[PDB]
Amino acid sequence: ESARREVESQAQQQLERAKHKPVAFAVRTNVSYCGVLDEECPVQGSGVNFEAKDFLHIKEKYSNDWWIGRLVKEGGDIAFIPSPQRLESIRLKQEQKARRSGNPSSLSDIGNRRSPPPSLAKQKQKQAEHVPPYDVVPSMRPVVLVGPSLKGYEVTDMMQKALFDFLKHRFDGRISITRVTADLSLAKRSVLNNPGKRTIIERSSARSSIAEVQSEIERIFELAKSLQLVVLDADTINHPAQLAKTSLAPIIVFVKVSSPKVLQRLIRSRGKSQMKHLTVQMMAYDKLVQCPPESFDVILDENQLEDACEHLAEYLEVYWRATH
Amino acid sequence: KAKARGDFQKLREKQQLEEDLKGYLDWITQAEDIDP
């Protein structure tokens, strides 16, 4: 007897089902835990050990308990991946694994008064950094572009356009350009509980710079759903952090000057008048790389736009072959 | 005896500093030519 085999096999041919159906809003696994140890996930869900990095997408709205993932790769292996609410629940049960951990005074507590953990050390707390473990995002994580300079300054104005230049005529259909200029330096995952919605109650938020800098992802959805990344240049995209954990997780390409010596040697390209940025230009490198940057996977670094072309193009093309 | 002072390094660092300038400039030069 197998009543599940009539359903799970139906479920298995329901998970991907028609395959060609476009996958929906992404659901990114971030907590690493064994997915093979305990057999679960409705369809028996034999997915590999969970981890961060892997950018999965959910479209099967069967049950809230476990979701479906789409890791960035050709084929997009489909497995019953835990929900954002349930992933922090599967990590919960292991809190008492090591000798009834928590408030209990477990030290030689075998006799008379005993101490089990009450419902106080679990996820009932930690509201300040209360963030959903899964990151809902969209299509082909756009790649962000950062080099040591001030955006909108001599060396940038000409060169910062040439970073895509070829990509406009080379990388299209798969990729598109939506040039925007805003200040994405206020929210990363969830900070403000009263976001932009009314400018009539004399709120200090509306008096500040909210709304347009808030709903960047909301309006870019129309292009993000188009399976195409975002190319933008503004006055805030200058360094790691903030954008390193903002509403869109970043793939960073480094337009670096390599040696600081040629930073100042290039900084006077046409004569002089660095007066807009001279000091902040030398620390423009120092504000991002002296401390371990732990970013810039694709270092667009060479004395060639043509070799930096292949350095930039090779990664994106393979990374974009995945969604095929 | 004279290589220990590092005099070869200065010329060694001079070539790369000169080599990584022309491609930096012409990239900047042709970028202006593509027009906004």
């Binding site: 090779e314 990664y315 393979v318 | 070869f8 010329l11 060694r12 070539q15 790369q16």
Partner: peptide, 26 residues
């Protein structure tokens, strides 16, 4: 000086270029 400069500068040519696969083949 020229011979040593060549043998010490063109040597890194391989270790820099050929690592094009190092980021990818990994």
């Amino acid at each position: 000086d020229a011979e040593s400069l060549t043998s010490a500068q063109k040597e890194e040519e391989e270790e820099k270029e050929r690592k094009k696969l190092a980021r990818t083949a990994s």
